[PDB]
């Protein structure tokens, strides 16, 4: 009924604490990330090209090409917080 949009972005390496967003990770079974949802966004910490590509309520489907349901909760958060690494994200936009 409503549009379903998916965006692939690449976030360049930055300094510690400045990835530009946080997540809420729900882990239904075991310690795997079932769903990864963007919680907060600091637009000024995001490069101009990606500043309008990630919003609160968006869900992260894949991190650097890996579906998040196969990652442990710590691996998801490590990837976001390891600002020395380029971070590729597959983002499902919320309608």
Author numbering: 145 to 239
Paper quotes:
LIM domain kinases (LIMK) are important regulators of actin cytoskeletal remodeling. These protein kinases phosphorylate the actin depolymerizing factor cofilin to suppress filament severing, and are key nodes between Rho GTPase cascades and actin. LIMKs across species have a common architecture, with two N-terminal tandem-zinc finger LIM domains followed by a PDZ domain, a predicted unstructured region enriched in serine, proline and glycine residues, and a C-terminal kinase domain. The LIMK PDZ domain is unusual however in that it does not interact tightly with carboxy-terminal peptides.
We expressed, purified, and crystallized the human LIMK2 PDZ domain (residues 145-236), which is monomeric in solution, and determined its structure to 2.0 Å resolution. The crystal structure revealed a compact globular domain resembling a partially open barrel that is typical of the PDZ fold. We observed the expected canonical six β-strands and the canonical αB helix, but unusually, found that helix αA is replaced by two 310 helices, which we term αA’ (residues R187-H189) and αA” (residues P192-N194). In addition, we found a third 310 helix in the βD-αB loop that we term the αB’ helix (residues V212-T214) (secondary structure nomenclature as per). We observed good electron density throughout the structure and that crystal packing appeared to induce a conformational movement in the βB-βC loop resulting in two orientations visible in the asymmetric unit. Instead, they harbor KRGL and RRGL sequences in LIMK1 and LIMK2 respectively, replacing the first hydrophobic residue with a conserved arginine residue, Arg163. Unusually for a charged residue, we found Arg163 in a similar orientation. It caps helix αB, hydrogen bonds to the carboxyl oxygens of residues Ala223, Ile224 and Gln226, and also hydrogen bonds to the carboxyl oxygen of Gln229 within the αB-βF loop. This arrangement seems to provide a rigid anchor for the C-terminus of the αB helix. In addition, an inward orientation of helix αB and placement of Arg163’s Cβ atom to encroach on the expected carboxylate binding site provides a potential explanation for why the LIMK PDZ domains do not interact with carboxy-terminal peptides with measured affinities in a biological range.
